[PDB]
Structure to design on (334 residues):
């Protein structure tokens, strides 16, 4: 008896009803810009499969960010490009401004708009209750848009949400793990940062969907309103699930496993032990209480659910009373 299959309860067939060339990124033909339009200024980061630089566009003197892709698979490069082009112009989605090659060595690089981001080590220390609601609503706009366009981000975490606080500007970045959703497809569960991985990933349930992004978003919310980053801090993947179960409780965890007929490694029942479901108020103290409200806790509680089918969609989340003051303030023209 294998696990019970699952499909997304919204936007299930968005790619099915779109032309092949929308989601078939291997057939995409890239049109290359000019590498000599950009000058690299300083290395911002490196990880993975790329190195990221602040750069200048020397045709107009604008700052941009250049990500040079190490020789990671061609297929992964075309997937990220196709997804960035598909989502371009969507709300709070980082803009891919150019794609270039070294003409001689054939090394590809993505060029993005620059975000002057307030460093997420600090920021989270002057953000008000209103600020959090505002930025959460903007993140939800981006997720509802990319989900509605048939795409899962799969790496939602504070490092991938750039915020230029003085311009109240937010961009969702690093689409290198993002994938097209197709119902019934079994996906790689090695995505997302450990601290933001959903239960589906940690119990190796491969037929997941957009709702994975909503778990990750719930983790960010908790860490922002309770001022504890990351909120669920496991020392490896097994322990990550234990940290979740110490809050959400083991009873609902086993009901989840039971519903999808999922088989856990023997050692898990050993280290998961037995834990009550805690009240969210347990994490409210003098220092974070100004960021917490009944609305906030009701919202968080509908995001952080084991069962991926029972979590709010991005759209439903934007309807939540937590955002009432944001939404009325954002209804304009100028
Ligand atoms: C000061 C500073 O860090 N500015 C930045 N502005 N946009 C950035 C960026 C955009 C996209 C990606 N990406 O998508 O992988 C990475 C980084 S970084």
């Amino acid at each position: 008896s294998g696990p019970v299959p699952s499909r997304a309860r919204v936007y299930t067939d968005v790619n099915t009803h779109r032309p092949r060339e929308y989601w078939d990124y291997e057939s995409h033909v890239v049109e290359w810009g000019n590498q000599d339009d950009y000058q690299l200024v300083r290395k911002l980061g490196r990880g993975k499969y790329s190195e990221v630089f602040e750069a200048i566009n020397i045709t107009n003197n604008e700052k941009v960010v250049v990500k040079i892709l190490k020789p990671v698979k061609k297929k992964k490069i075309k997937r990220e490009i196709k997804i960035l082009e598909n989502l371009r112009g969507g709300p709070n989605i980082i803009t891919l401004a150019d794609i270039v090659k070294d003409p001689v060595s054939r090394t590809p690089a993505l060029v993005f708009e620059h975000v002057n981001n307030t460093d997420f080590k600090q920021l989270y220390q002057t953000l008000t209750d209103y600020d959090i609601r505002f930025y959460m609503y903007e993140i939800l706009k981006a997720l509802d848009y990319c989900h509605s366009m048939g795409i899962m981000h799969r790496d939602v975490k504070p490092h991938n949400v750039m915020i230029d606080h003085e311009h109240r500007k937010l961009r969702l970045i690093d689409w290198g793990l993002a994938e097209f959703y197709h119902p019934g497809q079994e996906y790689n569960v090695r995505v997302a940062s450990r601290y933001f991985k959903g239960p589906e990933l940690l119990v190796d349930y491969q037929m997941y969907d957009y709702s994975l992004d909503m778990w990750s978003l719930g983790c960010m919310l908790a860490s922002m309103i309770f001022r504890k980053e990351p909120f669920f801090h496991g020392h490896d993947n097994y322990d990550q699930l234990v940290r979740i179960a110490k809050v959400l409780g083991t009873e609902d965890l086993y009901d989840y496993i039971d519903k999808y007929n999922i088989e856990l490694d023997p050692r898990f029942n050993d280290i998961l032990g037995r834990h009550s479901r805690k009240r969210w108020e347990r994490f409210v103290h003098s220092e974070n209480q100004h960021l917490v409200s009944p609305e906030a806790l009701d919202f968080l509680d509908k995001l952080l659910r084991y069962d991926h089918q029972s979590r709010l969609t991005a759209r439903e989340a934007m309807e939540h009373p937590y955002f009432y003051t944001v939404v009325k303030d954002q209804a304009r023209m100028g």
